[PDB]
Structure 1
């Protein structure tokens, strides 16, 4: 079961938070109901996976927490099918935490929102300062310094080739055939 550590922390995701939290009553239901011998539960808390949020991944990792690639995370979950944990889950429901120690960063929403603001702000500043220094430069040194700085592009036109066979130099075609073939075949036949 892909249960999250996100239980009304981030918010603004409808019932995602109540859907994943409710998946976690299966641990008590596995003892208190009959179906224990047919299904075993191996509830996995799925941590921060990459592949929106991917920009700030570096930022959050600087806290000494680990985010995962899809590959990494898929390796972790396949870890939960090795015969050792299968025996384990059969004995009693397994609760795996693949969160990468993200549960320890306090105010994860506020700390994420702080990281997005700091990266977006700097991105828009440098965008604005870069374009306002570009229009100033163009005012001072006219459009003539920027039309001679502009390069003419060349767009490819269809050149539909008949694709005749590529004829090698005689030396190369003489190697692939046996040397004894010369004047052996009637070329009329």
Structure 2
């Protein structure tokens, strides 16, 4: 959900909400029902719910804020509902992962915050499948903040906006000055100045070879066959 505000919430948003909240609940629900139906009790399923630190902060991401907020209920509802035996909850507050916002990521790292590559955050999650954390999660629901101290930034939105504005305006200005020095250079020195600096490109033509076998020098090929082979075989057979 990108650029859907509070007045724009519509069919797409509702579907997104149904993927990221409702059907996830239905999945756990159905896993409980299959475990319970076979009497599974010494083998609960460790669900790692992807929580977010952003709760209607950035805005214009439809019902992605309420989808990732509402899964917090699972931490409480582990105790007030009877499925606690079959499921264990590992809510992971997911920090900044890279690879639209990738340009400014270096910019936020100046603020003593860590943004992860996909492989760093994956390794972090796999942390939460280590035997010790599993055993931990079998006692109580676990929150794991892998935010990398980003939450410390006061009102992050305007700071990301300011970074975007400074990189985009530096880009634009350099582009404008690079065009609007070259143009006046072209007027001053004429087109004949940068006509000889305009170079010809030699586009390839297809040259379909019959790819005959390559015939090595006799010295080389003699070192593949042994000594006795020479004059040995009837070449007619």
SS in 2 for 1:81: coil
- Using the alignment, how far apart are the partners of 1:147 and 1:52 within structure 2? 38
Match of 1:92 in 2: 140
Deviation at 1:110, TM superposition (A): 0.5
Q: Which stretches of structure 1, 4 residues or longer, exceed 4 Å deviation after superposition?
A: none
Alignment gaps of 5+ in structure 1: none
2:152 aligns with 104
- Distance, in Å, in 2 between the alignment partners of 1:48 and 1:179 is 68
- Aligned to 1:63, what secondary structure does the other structure show? coil
Instruction: Find the aligned partners of 1:44 and 1:63 in 2 and give their Cα distance.
Output: 23
Q: How many residues end up aligned between the 2 structures?
A: 189
Q: 1:153-176 deviations in whole A, cap 9, x for unaligned?
A: 000000000000000000000000
**Could you say what secondary structure the match of 1:180 adopts?**
coil
Deviation at 1:116, TM superposition (A): 0.2
Q: Quote how far apart the aligned CAs of 1:179 are.
A: 1.2
What is the alpha-carbon distance in structure 2 between the residues aligned to residue 170 and residue 89 of structure 1? 72
Please state how far the C-alpha of 1:107 moved relative to its aligned partner.
Answer: 1.1
Deviation at 1:97, TM superposition (A): 0.1
Structure 2 unmatched runs, 5+: 1-48
Offset of 1:40 from its aligned partner?
0.3
RMSD: 0.4
TM-score under structure 2 length normalisation? 0.79
Residue 121 of structure 1, CA deviation: 0.4
Q: Deviations over 1:67-91 (max 9, x none)?
A: 0000000000000000000000001
User: Equivalent residue for 2:9?
Assistant: none
Q: SS of 1:141's equivalent? A: helix
Q: CA deviation at 1:51?
A: 1.1
Q: In the aligned structure 2, how far is the partner of 1:178 from the partner of 1:88?
A: 68
Query: How big is each residue's C-alpha offset from its partner over 1:124-182, in whole Å with a ceiling of 9 and x where there is no partner?
Result: 00000110000000000000011100110000000000000000000000000111100
Q: How many Å separate the matches in 2 of 1:108 and 1:179?
A: 79
| Counterpart Cα distance in 2 of 1:134 and 1:181 | 72
Could you report, residue by residue, the CA deviation over 1:19-40 in whole angstroms, capped at 9, with x for unpaired residues?
Answer: 0000110000001100001000
Which of residues 207, 215, 222 is equivalent to 1:159?
A: 207
Asked whether 1:117 is paired with 2:165, we answer: yes
In 2, Cα distance between equivalents of 1:174 and 1:126:
64
Structure-2 separation of matches of 1:32 and 1:83: 26
In the superposition, the TM-score normalised over structure 1's length comes to 0.99
SS in 2 for 1:45: strand
